[PDB]
């Protein structure tokens, strides 16, 4: 399964008041490092 997006983290990131769209794109450019993904998405 090509599950590059961890369910737990997806829910965590979205729970911060963000849509799945932001998660997918931010995760796509980070490759699993949601911590860095959040750092990326939050720069907007």
């Amino acid at each position: 399964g090509s599950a590059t997006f961890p369910e737990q983290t997806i829910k965590q990131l979205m729970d911060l008041g963000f849509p799945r769209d932001a998660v997918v794109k931010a995760l796509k450019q980070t490759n699993g490092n949601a911590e860095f993904a959040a750092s990326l998405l939050f720069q907007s």
């Binding site: 965590q12 990131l13 911060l16 008041g17 963000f18 860095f36 939050f42």
Partner: protein, 76 residues
């Protein structure tokens, strides 16, 4: 008043603040307990980013409100 700060680890940080408190001061409290630099502390309020140079009253943050904390590192 008491607030709930949600961490990326699914942790609920309960802190004591007031509307007359500044974001910078709030993060300072988190910095002391969590040991995380205020520079990497990004506070969120219902999907909206909070400015350090503002007060809780600026966003009408009342008691029992949930605040989010994103750890913004340097790099990727």
């Amino acid at each position: 008043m008491q607030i709930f700060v949600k961490t990326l680890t699914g942790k609920t940080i309960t802190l004591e603040v007031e509307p007359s408190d500044t974001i910078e001061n709030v993060k300072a409290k988190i910095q002391d307990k969590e040991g995380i630099p205020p520079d990497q502390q990004r506070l969120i309020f219902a999907g909206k980013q909070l400015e350090d140079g503002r007060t809780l009253s600026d966003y009408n943050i009342q008691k029992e409100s949930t605040l989010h904390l994103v750890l913004r590192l340097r790099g990727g």
